[PDB]
Structure formats: C-alpha cells, structure tokens
C-alpha cells in the first residue's frame, strides 16, 4: 500500500543511489589524520552504539551519525582528545534530523562523562553543520535494507535482524568498509543474512532493481563474511551485545556459515 | 555578514524564525530573509532549521521555493530565499467576492502537484500544506514553502511525529492516530486546498478534533466545479490512504488536459 510508496519507490531508489555517491566520505582519510586512527574510530562508533541503546534511538540515527563523522573527518583534522566531541555533536545532529523525540543536549553532555562542556557540544554542532554545509539527508545502509526487505516472500524477522546486525558491524571498521557504498554493504548484508538463516540467495528481483549480482557483490561479501566470523574476537563488542536481545531475535548468537558456497568453475577450487 | 541587505518590512512568522522582506543593495535583488535565533547556551540549532535547510538544498524545482543562501553567524542563522509577492491565503481572501478563474485554479493545482510529486519522488513529506505556505508571483507561478515541518522518509515508512498538519488540512489517518502515514497525507491537504480555491472557504474548518472528523464524515459520507474537477477532488479526498490518488497519477488526470499558465487575476 501507500506506506510502501508504490508510485515513487523506484524514483526514490534511483535518487538514493545518486546521493550515496555524493555523500560518500573519503576512502583514505585516516591516512591524512596525523593524530587519530581507524582503531580510535572503532572505539567511537562502538560507543555511539551504546548511546543509541541507552537512549533507545533508531538504528537510522546511528548510521547517519557515522556518515557525518566520516564526512567531517574527511575535511577536518581532529586531535585525539576531541574525537569524542565530534562524535557527540554528530549523534546530536543525527537525532535532531531523524528522531521524533531526540534526547536533550544535557543528555549528550552527560554521556561524555563531563570531559566536555555543554558549550563545547553546542559549538561543535555548529562547526559540523558548517563543514557539512547542512547536507544531512544522507543515504544509509539502513535505508537500502528496508527497501531490500520488501523483496522477501514472506518476511523473515531473523533475516531482517541479522542483515541489520551485519550492516551495523561494517560501521565499526573503516578498513575495509569505507571503500563500499551503503547500497552495496546493504546488498552483501542482506544476502549473507538470507543465506545464514534460510540458505537462500540474493533475489533475482533485487538483481533487476539494484543491478547488483553476487559477482559484483563478491568483494564486499567476502569482507563481510570475514568480519562476521571474527566478530566474537573483535575489540569492539557493543553491537554483538545489542543483537543478543529478544528485540533483535538474538541474531548475534547464531553461528555464521563456515563457507558461502559461491560458484567456482575450476576442479581445484 | 548581512551588510549588503536592507530590510524593507516584516513579512511574518512561520513554523520557526521570522521572515523579512529585504533588498540586496549591490544587485538590486529583492529577497525574503528568514532569521533564526540560536540558542547557543541551551539547545543549539533547531531540528526544524536542520530539516528545512538540508531538504531545500536538495530540492530544486520550479514549484518549490528557492533557498539562495545560508548566512551562518555565531548567534543567528539567516536564510536567504527568493521573494514571492503573495501567499495563496491572502490571494483567496482578496478574491472572496470576485472568485478565482478556473484556468488559474487548474494551473495552480497542476503546479502544486508537480512540486509535490517532486518532493515525494525525493523521499520528502511536506506535512504542512496550507494556503499560507503556498506562494505566488506575478507571472503565474505557485510554489511550496515553509519546510520546517517536513521530513525525509524511508521506504517503507515508519512511525513519525503525530502533531503534524494544521487541523483543517489534516488527513483522517492522522486524526484517527494510525501508527503509519505516508505521502497520501500531503495529497489530502492539496485536495482541501483545491476545494478552497474554488469556494474561497476552508473545506473542513473544524473547531476541534471531533468537529473536524464530523465535518469530514458529513461531506464524503463544491458547486461550480465540472465533472472532471469533482472526479479528481474525490480521488484526492479518498478516505483510504491506499486508494487516495498520488501526485504523479493526479498530473495525468483528464482535468489537466487543457491546462495553461494564466497570470493572476488581481495584481
Ligand atoms: C510561508 C510563510 C512565510 C512567513 O509567514 N511567508 C512568506 N511569504 C512570502 N511572500 C508573501 C508575502 C509578501 C509580502 C508580505 C507578506 C507576505 C515569502 N516569500 C518568500 N518567503 C519565504 C519562503 C522565506 C516567503 N514567506
């Protein structure tokens, strides 16, 4: 029905595919940050996951905040002691954009444990808006996933939760995930979740919609599979903890598949 | 930062901020300035501004008001908009006795649907389509304005803010508090506006939520409108949000086969 916007979904998909290219952060950016690293970024993103859980925020808000952080850090050098300030302001901005009831500024100050002042958070909010030129309506993995989910017959709640779990894991690790577009990560996440739960593969109807085949998705899929396998040993554990809950059907407790059983023509493969 | 602008008169106050008519002293351009106060020690930049600026920077269409510049001071934000001479509410009031010619009504509705189709195609719900937010110029154009209550939506939609759309233009699915609402809510509003252009009276001027619902129940269960007009209107005001016509489909309706672009009709 109209909640699925039949007359516009294809226009919207085409537009989002245009915009994700324009909203893409710089792939190499951390190499050009003298004071911060991918490991520090992982700590920050993992913390934002915790914040999102604590304040019961939308996963979309979390994805938006990460996009803002990566775009900001693509343009602006930030010292280590100020990284969490960028993150806090990003999460505040994402919340104002996306949430019906965003937390008040005082709650964002509280979550940072009084390292920063309220003035600092507010001034950083303004700086982030300037640097991003108010361009905050970024396409997320989540936005593509919900569109992909409509191709289920019927809907599978464990598939949906696991795909979201895998998409979320990708936010933690700039290497490799910065080189992949949200539509591609969502596609690889959907396939991997579909296969883990049901044994099914990336649907033909989504091949026609997205133009993505398992062949084009392979590099991202192989990365995501490895991330999934190594997940219980990752330094960052908030997403796994989150997805143990009944809300997400305890999908982080599921065993990842040992192999993807992808097509290999050679006898020795 | 605002040295080049000379304020002329106060225009009014919309969803947020204050709007002034101003002139650019260097280029001669007449603009509308929306002044937004921050809030620098408490809540920062309002979500209304964040949404309107972000979305209006994306939305470039003849029937959506043009955002020209954002001037980013420490304590205030100034949005520079194109100036439009009149709003549709004032125009209808000015036309209370004369009426509005059908070709202009048809042109305005066609353009509003073009603008709205553009919004929905770019995942934006307006959610505040009332005559006060529809702006007209001397050349026959009409444009959507005040995106303070607008929202970028996902597919499929999830639950959004309930306190949306001023009472008179509020779709039944909002009034009854359905957990989901979509692009259909904007169509309802434009249907109400269509009727209001024909009569120069609000279609459902409810005094309360119950009165609002009763007024809707009466009518569905506009004299001077032809068969094609009433056909389109009934489809724009369908009770079922699923059955309600889309802006896209509305543009293809027989009512518009002979559409032109007349000039108002009053100054
Ligand atoms: C939409 C509501 C806004 C504030 O009442 N009114 C308004 N009205 C506008 N024009 C109508 C008008 C002109 C002069 C006086 C009163 C109203 C106008 N033009 C550009 N802009 C914007 C989008 C900042 C305009 N805004």
Query: Do A215 and A169 share a domain, yes or no?
Result: yes
Query: Do A36 and A119 share a domain, yes or no?
Result: yes
Q: At what angle do helices B47-58 and A83-98 cross, to 10 degrees?
A: 80
Nearest to B266 by CA among B151, B97, B148: B97
Considering only the beta carbons, identify the residue of B44, B160, B182 that sits closest to A125: B44
Query: Rounded to an integer, what distance in angstroms lies between the CA atom of residue A244 and that of residue A133?
Result: 38
Residue A187 lies in a domain: yes
Query: Do A143 and A19 share a domain, yes or no?
Result: yes
Find the closest chain A residue to B79 by CA distance.
Answer: A134
Q: Which residues lie closer than 8 Å to B57 by C-beta, 6 or more apart?
A: A133, A134, A135, B67
Q: Residue B124 annotated as binding?
A: no
Q: Do B57 and B63 meet the contact criterion of CB atoms below 8 Å apart?
A: no
How were these coordinates obtained? X-ray
Q: Which residues lie closer than 8 Å to A173 by C-beta, 6 or more apart?
A: A38, A42, A227
Query: Rounded to an integer, what distance in angstroms lies between the CA atom of residue A158 and that of residue B69?
Result: 46
Using CA positions, which residue lies closest to atom 14 of ligand 1? B11
Q: Is B52 in the pocket of ligand 1 (CB under 6 A)?
A: no
Strand partners, B24: B5
Interchain pair A137, B152: CB under 8 A: yes
- Chain Cα centroid distance, residue A80: 23
Superfamily in which the B86-264 domain is placed by CATH: Transferase(Phosphotransferase) domain 1 (1.10.510.10)
Helix (H) or strand (E) holding B37: strand B30-37
Interchain pair B123, A104: CB under 8 A: no
Q: Which of A137, A166, A201 is the last residue of a domain?
A: A137
Helix (H) or strand (E) holding A41: helix A38-54
Considering only the beta carbons, identify the residue of A2, A4, A102 that sits closest to B47: A102
Tell me the CA–centroid distance for residue B186 and ligand 1, in Å. Answer: 20
A109: domain range? 25-137
Resolution (A): 1.8
Residue A6 lies in a domain: no
Grouping H, G, I as helix, E, B as strand and the rest as coil, residue B39 is coil
How many residues are listed for chain A in this entry? 269
Give B67's contacts in chain A (Cβ within 8 Å): none
Q: Do B148 and B51 meet the contact criterion of CB atoms below 8 Å apart?
A: yes
Give A63's contacts in chain B (Cβ within 8 Å): none
Interchain pair B156, A143: CB under 8 A: no
Domain ranges of chain B: 2-85, 86-264
Tell me the CA–centroid distance for residue A53 and ligand 1, in Å. Answer: 42
Tell me the CA–centroid distance for residue B69 and ligand 1, in Å. Answer: 16
- The token duo for A53 is 């859980």
What is the 3-state composition of chain B as percent helix, strand, coil, each rounded to the nearest 5? Answer: 35, 20, 45
Nearest to B261 by CA among B32, B117, B63: B63
Q: Residue B93 annotated as binding?
A: no
Cα–Cα separations (whole angstroms), residue A248 to A51, A163, A236, A237, B154: 17, 11, 19, 16, 20
Query: Do A19 and A143 share a domain, yes or no?
Result: yes
Query: Rounded to an integer, what distance in angstroms lies between the CA atom of residue A267 and that of residue A90?
Result: 51
Query: Rounded to an integer, what distance in angstroms lies between the CA atom of residue B140 and that of residue B157?
Result: 35
Please confirm, yes or no, whether B128 is among the known catalytic residues: yes
Q: Do A193 and A166 meet the contact criterion of CB atoms below 8 Å apart?
A: yes
Q: Which of B145, B147, B264 to mutate to test the pocket of ligand 1 (most atoms within 8 A of CB)?
A: B145
Cα–Cα separations (whole angstroms), residue A78 to A35, A40, A86, A133, A200: 7, 12, 8, 18, 44
Find the closest chain B residue to A139 by CA distance.
Answer: B154
Query: Do A35 and A19 share a domain, yes or no?
Result: no
Q: Do A8 and B248 meet the contact criterion of CB atoms below 8 Å apart?
A: yes
Residue A62 lies in a domain: yes
Query: Do A20 and A146 share a domain, yes or no?
Result: yes
Query: Do A156 and A269 share a domain, yes or no?
Result: yes
Is CATH 3.30.300.130 what the domain over B2-85 is classified as, yes or no?
A: no
Query: Do A142 and A227 share a domain, yes or no?
Result: yes
Strand partners, B72: B77
Query: Do A120 and A238 share a domain, yes or no?
Result: no
Residue A3 lies in a domain: no
Q: Is B11 in the pocket of ligand 1 (CB under 6 A)?
A: yes
Helix, strand counts (H, E) of chain B: 8, 10
Query: Do A64 and A182 share a domain, yes or no?
Result: no
Query: Do A167 and A55 share a domain, yes or no?
Result: no
CATH, residue A117: 1.10.472.10
Query: Do A50 and A154 share a domain, yes or no?
Result: no
Atom of ligand 1 nearest to the CA of B84: 19
Query: Rounded to an integer, what distance in angstroms lies between the CA atom of residue B169 and that of residue B194?
Result: 11
Residue A5 lies in a domain: no
Sheet holding B5-12, edge to edge: B5-12, B18-24, B30-37, B76-82, B67-72
Cα–Cα separations (whole angstroms), residue A173 to A27, A77, A138, A178, A234: 12, 19, 19, 8, 10
Domain count for chain A, please give it: 2
Residue A1 lies in a domain: no
Residue A50 lies in a domain: yes
Q: Residue B15 annotated as binding?
A: yes
Considering only the beta carbons, identify the residue of A12, A100, A136 that sits closest to B121: A12
Q: Which of A96, A115, A137 is the last residue of a domain?
A: A137
Grouping H, G, I as helix, E, B as strand and the rest as coil, residue B243 is coil
Query: Rounded to an integer, what distance in angstroms lies between the CA atom of residue B186 and that of residue B164?
Result: 11
Nearest to B63 by CA among B231, B211, B266, B247: B247
Residue A170 lies in a domain: yes
Q: Which of A106, A137, A168 is the last residue of a domain?
A: A137
CB-based burial, A4-27: b 16+ in 10 Å, e otherwise:
ebebbbebbbebbbebbeebbbeb
- The token duo for B251 is 């543009």
């Amino acid at each position: 029905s109209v909640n699925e916007v039949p007359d516009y979904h294809e226009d919207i998909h085409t537009y989002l595919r245009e915009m994700e290219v324009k909203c893409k952060p710089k792939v190499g950016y951390m190499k050009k940050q003298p004071d911060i690293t991918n490991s520090m970024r992982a700590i920050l993103v993992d913390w934002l996951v915790e914040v999102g859980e604590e304040y019961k925020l939308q996963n979309e808000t979390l994805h938006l905040a990460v996009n803002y952080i990566d775009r900001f850090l693509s343009s602006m050098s930030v010292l280590r002691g100020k990284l969490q300030l960028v993150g806090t302001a990003a999460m505040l901005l994402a919340s104002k954009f996306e949430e019906i009831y965003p937390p008040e500024v005082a709650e964002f100050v509280y979550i940072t444990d009084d390292t920063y002042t309220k003035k600092q958070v507010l001034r950083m909010e303004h700086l982030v808006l300037k640097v991003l030129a108010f361009d905050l309506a970024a396409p997320t993995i989540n936005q593509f996933l919900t569109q992909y989910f409509l191709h289920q017959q019927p809907a599978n709640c464990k598939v949906e939760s696991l795909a979201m779990f895998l998409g979320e894991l990708s936010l933690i690790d700039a290497d490799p995930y910065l080189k992949y577009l949200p539509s591609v990560i969502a596609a690889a996440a959907f396939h991997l979740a579909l296969y883990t739960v049901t044994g099914q593969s990336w649907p033909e109807s989504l091949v026609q919609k997205t133009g993505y085949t398992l062949e084009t998705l392979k590099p991202c899929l192989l990365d995501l599979h490895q991330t999934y396998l190594r997940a219980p040993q990752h330094a960052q554990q908030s997403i796994r903890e989150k997805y143990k809950n009944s809300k997400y059907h305890g999908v982080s407790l599921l065993n990842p598949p040992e192999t993807l059983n992808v097509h290999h023509h050679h006898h020795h493969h | 930062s605002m040295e080049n602008f000379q304020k002329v008169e106060k225009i009014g106050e919309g969803t947020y901020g204050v709007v002034y008519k101003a002139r650019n002293k260097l280029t001669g351009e007449v603009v509308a300035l929306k002044k937004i106060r921050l809030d620098t020690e408490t809540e920062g930049v309002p979500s209304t501004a964040i949404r309107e600026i972000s979305l209006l920077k994306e939305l470039n269409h003849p029937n959506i008001v043009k955002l020209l510049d954002v001037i980013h001071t420490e304590n205030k934000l100034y949005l520079v908009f194109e100036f439009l001479h009149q709003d549709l509410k004032k125009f209808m009031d000015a036309s209370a006795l004369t009426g509005i010619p059908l070709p202009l009504i048809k042109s305005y509705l066609f353009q509003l649907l073009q603008g709205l189709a553009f919004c929905h195609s770019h995942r934006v719900l307006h959610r505040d389509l009332k005559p006060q937010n529809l702006l007209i110029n001397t050349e026959g154009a009409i444009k959507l304005a005040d995106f303070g209550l607008a929202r970028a939506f996902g597919v499929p939609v999830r639950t959004y803010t309930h306190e949306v759309v001023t009472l008179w233009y509020r779709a039944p699915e909002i009034l009854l508090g359905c957990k989901y609402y979509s692009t259909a809510v904007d169509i309802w509003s434009l249907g109400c506006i269509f009727a209001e252009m024909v009569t120069r009276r609000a279609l459902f001027p409810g005094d309360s939520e119950i009165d609002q619902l009763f007024r809707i129940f009466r009518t569905l269960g506009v004299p001077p409108l032809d068969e094609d007009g009433r056909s389109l209107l009934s489809q724009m005001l369908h009770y079922d949000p699923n059955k309600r016509i889309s802006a896209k489909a509305a543009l293809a309706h027989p009512f518009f086969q002979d559409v032109t672009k007349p000039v108002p009709h009053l100054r």
